[PDB]
Design a protein around this ligand. Structure first.
Ligand code: MLY
Length: 325
């Protein structure tokens, strides 16, 4: 039997304190009421502005694997039961959002009552969730306002962006005149967003809207006038202090190569808002960077307290394939 207590003694190591994580990353006493076969609604992680019909394909501890109805299983993805990116059946119609129907359907063609009959299934109960859009909005951020944001797909770019939607306590960041595949959900403390004018005060180049006429001479004031849009007010931005994870601290993290697994991990390197994860016993070739507030990193003990299997360090110490670290 593997235990953190014994491992720390053996390695003469320390864990990353629970206080370093967000409450949502650390909470272990919540029940996961989702069951295999339950259907629901959710955003496509690779297309944050789109909503699809999803089915619980697997349950493990406080996590569940979701399947896009009608599409290939290669698109399946895992989330935690407290994910704010899934909603109960009927949410889209109740909140006025659009649905991308199951493969083989047209949008006019979808009705939850009929679909459940056709699939002889049941929708996940409303109480099973966390976001159904009854919550406090993000103060100061309204649809239509503009701001500057980092393109997470092209990290060196800070661009002209807009708030295109607000759901409970989060808002959707959209890159002006770029396709919505670049959109991503945020909250007021995100270190990836800044008020209009930030780049100029920092000396950083600002990426104007796609194909903006004479891009070199882009001027926020002129653009705000052309669009009649307001800039998100400066007071609304509540910058988050850099995290306090230190190199070598131990924790638990979802494996990026096989998301069904969670392994014993160590902080390999650090940035102001991200940490580099290294899986104990493994080579460093699989090490990866991840946001400090990412939903897939947790404090030691998360797995055992939630009922999820934890992969112990890989054995072999260099003599076995993929080891050395
Ligand atoms: C700025 N960012 C939001 C989008 C960048 C898109 C780059 C892509 N090669 C293209 O030119 O379409």
């Amino acid at each position: 039997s593997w235990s953190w207590e014994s491992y720390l003694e053996e390695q003469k190591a320390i864990t990353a304190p629970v206080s370093l994580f967000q409450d949502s990353q650390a909470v272990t006493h919540n029940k996961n009421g989702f069951k295999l076969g339950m259907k629901l609604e959710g955003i496509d992680p690779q297309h944050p502005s789109m909503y699809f019909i999803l089915t619980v394909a697997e349950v493990c501890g406080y996590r569940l694997r979701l399947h896009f109805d009608g599409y290939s299983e290669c698109h399946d993805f895992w989330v935690n039961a407290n994910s704010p990116d899934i909603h109960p059946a009927g949410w889209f119609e109740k909140t006025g959002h659009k649905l991308q129907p199951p493969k083989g359907y047209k949008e006019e063609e979808f009705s939850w009552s009929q679909y459940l009959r056709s699939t002889r299934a049941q929708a996940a109960p409303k109480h099973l969730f966390v976001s159904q859009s009854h919550s406090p909005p993000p103060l100061g951020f309204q649809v239509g306002m503009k701001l500057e944001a980092v393109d997470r797909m092209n990290p060196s770019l800070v661009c002209v962006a807009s708030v295109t939607d607000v759901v409970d306590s989060r808002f959707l960041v959209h890159f002006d005149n770029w396709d919505d595949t670049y959109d991503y959900w945020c909250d007021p403390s995100s270190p990836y967003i800044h008020p209009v004018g930030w780049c100029q005060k920092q000396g950083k180049p600002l990426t104007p809207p796609q194909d903006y006429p004479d891009p070199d001479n882009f001027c926020w004031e002129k653009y705000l006038e052309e669009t009649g849009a307001s800039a998100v007010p400066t007071w609304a931005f509540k910058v988050r202090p850099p995290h306090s994870f230190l190199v070598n601290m131990k924790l638990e993290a979802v494996d990026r190569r096989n998301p069904a697994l969670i392994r014993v991990a160590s902080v390999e390197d650090v940035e102001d808002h991200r940490i580099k994860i290294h899986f104990d016993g493994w080579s460093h070739g699989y090490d990866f960077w991840i946001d400090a507030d990412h939903p897939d990193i947790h404090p030691a003990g998360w797995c055992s307290k939630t009922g999820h299997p934890l992969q112990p360090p890989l054995g072999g110490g260099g003599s076995a394939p993929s080891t050395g670290g």
